[PDB]
Amino acid sequence: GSMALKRIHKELNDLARDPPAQCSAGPVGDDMFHWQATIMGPNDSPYQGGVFFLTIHFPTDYPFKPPKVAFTTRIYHPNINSNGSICLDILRSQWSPALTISKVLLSICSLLCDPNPDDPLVPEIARIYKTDREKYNRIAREWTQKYAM
């Protein structure tokens, strides 16, 4: 039907033959515009062994507009809301039709490995992240242990 739908389906096929490293995604039921993603916690992070779930909402004009991505699993991170809302450039103003869910997930993993405190979504976690790195790592591990695994 639409170009967005064909895009989402070819993208789904590319994901079923070349899945991103440490990541997977797919349709929640029969709707193609509603996906669920899974990111297993990166090893270069206090998020290890944890399995994190995300929701993905594709816009009606999708490849020309960014996907709404949010965490389902609770997580202790400077750029991630308590609503699971993500502060990521490529999901807002650095978006482009070239970017794909594969690239978005990979980018989110990179965001878990190396947060951006300069543009915090949780001010306090960012402040702790650039004053008490031990406290940050510690709490991150704990929250990784009570919600992820």
């Binding site: 170009m3 064909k6 895009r7 490849p63 020309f64 482009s96 039709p97 070239a98």
Partner: protein
């Protein structure tokens, strides 16, 4: 063989965007791009398109 159009992932890249110089799109998707047309890879304005006599 080659990489597919970065936009629809179903066709061969068939043209070049100026002035950034990226080969990333098919003709149709290029027409599909919303005006003001920006490169899907670097988002710079597409001021000229030169077809690839490929595909």
């Amino acid at each position: 063989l080659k990489s597919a159009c970065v936009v629809c992932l179903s066709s061969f890249k068939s043209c070049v965007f100026l002035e950034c110089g990226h080969v990333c799109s098919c003709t149709e998707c290029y027409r599909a791009l919303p005006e003001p047309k920006k490169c899907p890879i670097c988002r710079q304005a597409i001021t000229r398109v030169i077809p690839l006599y490929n595909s």
